[PDB]
Amino acid sequence: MENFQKVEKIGEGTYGVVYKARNKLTGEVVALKKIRTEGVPSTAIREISLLKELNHPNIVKLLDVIHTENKLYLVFEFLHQDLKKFMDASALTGIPLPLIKSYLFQLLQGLAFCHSHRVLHRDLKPQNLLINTEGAIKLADFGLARAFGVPVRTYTHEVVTLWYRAPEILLGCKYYSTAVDIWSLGCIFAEMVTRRALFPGDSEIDQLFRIFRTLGTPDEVVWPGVTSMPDYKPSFPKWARQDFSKVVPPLDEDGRSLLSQMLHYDPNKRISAKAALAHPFFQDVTKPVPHLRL
Numbered sequence: 001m002e003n004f005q006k007v008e009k010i011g012e013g014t015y016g017v018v019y020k021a022r023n024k025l026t027g028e029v030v031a032l033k034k035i036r037t038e039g040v041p042s043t044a045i046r047e048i049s050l051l052k053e054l055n056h057p058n059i060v061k062l063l064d065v066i067h068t069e070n071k072l073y074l075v076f077e078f079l080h081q082d083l084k085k086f087m088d089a090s091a092l093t094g095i096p097l098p099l100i101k102s103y104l105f106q107l108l109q110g111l112a113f114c115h116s117h118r119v120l121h122r123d124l125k126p127q128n129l130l131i132n133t134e135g136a137i138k139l140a141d142f143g144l145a146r147a148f149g150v151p152v153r154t155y156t157h158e159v160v161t162l163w164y165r166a167p168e169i170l171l172g173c174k175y176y177s178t179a180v181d182i183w184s185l186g187c188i189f190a191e192m193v194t195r196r197a198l199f200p201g202d203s204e205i206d207q208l209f210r211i212f213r214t215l216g217t218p219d220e221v222v223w224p225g226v227t228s229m230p231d232y233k234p235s236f237p238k239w240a241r242q243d244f245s246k247v248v249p250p251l252d253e254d255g256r257s258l259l260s261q262m263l264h265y266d267p268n269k270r271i272s273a274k275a276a277l278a279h280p281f282f283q284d285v286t287k288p289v290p291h292l293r294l
């Protein structure tokens with residue numbers, strides 16, 4: 001776009017290259033995202049436009065949608081770092097619990113807002129959770145999955161991670177509920193605490209079986225209707241559930257209680273973002289300033 005000065009390539013996004021750019025007219029720095037091929041369907045256009053109104057402090061603001069020469073460019077609010085990089089840079093000591101709680105608290109507020117408007121992310125991951133020097137954290141690319149389906153590989157052939165994918169998705173559910181985002185956030189919560197990914201699957205079955213080995217193979221008791229799902233197989237190995245005290249030490253009882261509810265197999269039983277915000281784990285939540293060195 002002639003109105004933007006591509007100052008730098010930030011990285012490779014799910015849909016295309018993501019650039020840091022400056023608007024010549026306003027002078028504001030933004031995140032420019034190129035999306036993908038035939039002419040862009042009107043459905044995607046209408047879906048994306050609805051996102052311009054989904055405004056919240058914990059959601060990366062969609063500034064503009066530029067469709068020209070049959071090409072789509074999304075203009076977003078720009079943040080200097082993602083949670084993936086921050087966790088890597090805090091590996092030696094791990095993110096202080098107060099900051100972890102603050103981030104989870106803010107993330108849940110963002111989900112609650114989007115979910116109340118029936119909008120899902122469907123592909124939450126450390127890579128699209130952005131933070132600033134003021135202690136805030138925001139969800140990026142919310143709603144794009146519905147507009148543009150999440151691919152197996154990105155334009156750069158990079159494999160889209162399955163680490164945060166909810167079990168109902170892995171089992172072939174055709175209709176996603178807001179519960180898929182709580183699952184993903186639960187996995188990220190566990191990762192911030194232990195400093196290691198919870199379920200680092202490298203294939204759909206490996207992902208599913210890693211979940212099964214930790215939470216126990218799901219059955220009709222804990223998940224009514226699971227055996228009738230598209231990709232469920234009666235031949236799945238039967239693993240017993242591990243205690244959370246072993247899965248996420250040194251998370252306290254409040255944190256483990258909340259995580260368990262965010263990781264419930266049955267999407268309907270899984271806690272909502274709104275109910276999670278009222279959980280005792282957040283009784284002493286604060287907003288610490290993070291140590292960011294840009």
Ligand SMILES: Nc1nccc(-c2cc(Cl)sc2Cl)n1
Nearest residue numbers: 011012018031076079128140
């Ligand atoms: N909005 C924004 N701002 C800075 C970086 C990004 C970003 C860059 C990626 Cl690569 S994924 C992702 Cl999310 N988005």
